[PDB]
Design a binder for this molecule. Sequence first.
Ligand code: MG
Ligand code: MG
Lengths: 111, 131, 114, 138, 99, 217, 45
Amino acid sequence: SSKNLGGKSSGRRQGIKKMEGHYVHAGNIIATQRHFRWHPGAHVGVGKNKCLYALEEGIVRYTKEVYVPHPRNTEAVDLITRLPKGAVLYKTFVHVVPAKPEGTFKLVAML
Amino acid sequence: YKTKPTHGIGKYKHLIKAEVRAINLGTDYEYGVLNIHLTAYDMTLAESYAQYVHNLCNSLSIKVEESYAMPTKTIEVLQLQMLLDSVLTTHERVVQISGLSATFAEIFLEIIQSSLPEGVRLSVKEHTEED
Amino acid sequence: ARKERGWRTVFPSREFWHRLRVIRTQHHVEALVEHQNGKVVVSASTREWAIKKHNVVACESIGRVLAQRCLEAGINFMVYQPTPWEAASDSMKRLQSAMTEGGVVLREPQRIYE
Amino acid sequence: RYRRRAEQEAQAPHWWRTYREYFGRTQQLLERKQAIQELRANVEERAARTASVPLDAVRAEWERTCGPYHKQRLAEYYGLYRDLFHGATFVPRVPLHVAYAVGEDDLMPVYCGNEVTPTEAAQAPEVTYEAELWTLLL
Amino acid sequence: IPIEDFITPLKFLDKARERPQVELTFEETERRALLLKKWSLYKQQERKMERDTIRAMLEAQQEALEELQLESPKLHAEAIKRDPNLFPFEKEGPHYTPP
Amino acid sequence: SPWRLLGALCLQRPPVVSKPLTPLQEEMASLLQQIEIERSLYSDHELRALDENQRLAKKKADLAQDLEDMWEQKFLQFKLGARITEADEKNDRTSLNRKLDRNLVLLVREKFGDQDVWILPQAEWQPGETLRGTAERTLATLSENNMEAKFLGNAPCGHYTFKFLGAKVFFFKALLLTGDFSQAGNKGHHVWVTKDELGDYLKPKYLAQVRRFVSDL
Amino acid sequence: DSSRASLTRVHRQAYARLYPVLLVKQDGSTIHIRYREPRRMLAMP
RNA sequence: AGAGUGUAGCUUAAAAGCACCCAACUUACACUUAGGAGAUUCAAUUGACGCUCUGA
Ligand SMILES: [Mg+2]
Ligand SMILES: [Mg+2]
């Protein structure tokens, strides 16, 4: 008969959309997941899904940085407290090294 | 990534332990969970003593797993001669201690003796009790 | 000019231009002004040996000094981003007050897009 | 403590790429001690239990001593040494006090980094620096 | 069944109007402040002394355990062996008057 | 390498009476008391004194004192044992009951042929015998008394080296619960001693270093 | 070192008064105690 | 009588940073907030007082 029934769910198609070095315009989704596999860094936002999106035009970069959580989020704090006195956690981040300058001064007129 | 040289830089769970006998071997020794029962008539005094003990333990790199208090026993005594009542109370406060190597324990005991407050009594014995 | 927008999981927030970083230790109280770069522009410490002459009061004094320094530099805006306990603390509050008095806003205006 | 440790780690270089990669007397002492002692005596704690500290004096002291040290940092921030001198830093030792005239009084002072408009800076400023020869430049 | 005596009883709720009056002077408060710091200092000194006492003792013990070992490798182990005397250790503290 | 085998014991007396407080300490205590008085919320005497008194006056217009008096009388009656059974004796160095406030230690005399040894309970342990056992034996023997010498552990306190023939002197701790002494004025010159006293009496460097592992107090 | 944990304040907030009572058990030994009401002496049988 | 030397507990600090202590939150510890105390052993890289170690 088969006692087990139910798990016929498809794959979520999650993962990295933009790998390191890829040029990225503002608003594009860099990477999608459940549970922070990758974290947001410079010029990278977060949705409600934990999906990372780019906040500026330029090159995506991945980097191992030091994890220091917000003091109001409690679990992380607890974990930190638990750790021995020389250790630091480390975590993988996604930055967007911005390409163009925010703007340039151009000549309007000679008054 | 796994194939990268950076693999497992985020690994933290081996730095945390998220999960009793008396081991007296040959040249390396351990007393098993010693309960220091601080019996006294003043509520404050016993507590103070307990606190001090705890502090000492902390200083000396010794674990303090439990530091509960036992209930206050109302020993109601009739002062016979004309019945004059005197409802005294005895307060017991405990500080459990695990790891302790040969030389340390004696020293600790000595320290305790030196520090003993005025009208307070000790009892250092094993964990096997029913609260 | 832009601000680093993200770092939303991490603390503290790098969305600023100028950051006021207070460093309390044993003895002496540092009070800095920083960029995204980490370039320490304007400091005020009790270790400076000029304000070592003449603690909550000390902290306040330092803050006051910094405010003057900020003015001199032409830094008028910070995002002060402390821990909750730090925020609560009296000394920090005093420092903030001093800064305000000096004329250095601890909020910092928006980027202006478009 | 953890935060401090993290900061320290960040400050260190590492080998895995990162955010930095892609974006970035005895007598005097004795005298000082004595002074401190005197101050303490004067206080005698009561004062602490809300004293203001004279700011002008402090400023003067700063100017005398570590003002020069401070100014280098400021210069670096403002990119004078990279633009003005193509690189290569220096500590401005001599304390320069330039002030622009506005009416009869007041005088608008030019500290290092201050906002001052061309209206106030229409006429040439008054200058003082307390030293004994030089070539002033703007 | 762990039941402690930390709960503030129900007898003390209504009977709370007898002393709300705490009105100190400047002089008194100042004096208190002066005292407290001094007391703290004294405590610190005492703890330092205690530490010294402990440390010295430890050192002595270590020395003994070096010497013993040097002069009898059979005996060091024996010395180390924790005796059974400390199952029921008992001692009352000092009183104010003897019998 | 003939190691001559001498044991020893650094005997201890637990202080009976409490210590006298320092001026500062006293002041602190007083302050604490005051604070306690301030904070506290009712007393059974204070409720049954004040209110009652108030009532009485009212009644008149229309107990505690006696109790206090009684208490005072009782206090007057109850004569206590002396804290000072030390300075009143003064010359009594040989009595165990002497210093109630401080801890104490035994200190014996032995004049030999070659040396003339001012001694802290020494012993001569046998290779087959244990050190602890030897110490116990010594305690039993030389002083000649019936004692409950509560030890702590089998590990020692401090050892010391004299070398002519290599040799040693091995010290332990023992805390006297109740030492029933037979014949107070015997010829074996034994002395009970505080910290200062210990420092004073001891001529040699061998026993002058013993005072570091004594409890200073 | 017997006076280190002797200088004790009541760390609880709401509580009764307490007086320096001299308690004596059958050993003949006084103790400073904080018993109900100002009972100076309470000799124990 | 000789060797190693010599910043407060400690330091590839140069008057620092950690350790440390009293209060108030705390069953207590812990955290946190307020306070507290501290040092170049002494004379011009040299010498003379302090320890540690080895002899008598
Ligand atoms: Mg599936
Ligand atoms: Mg499927």
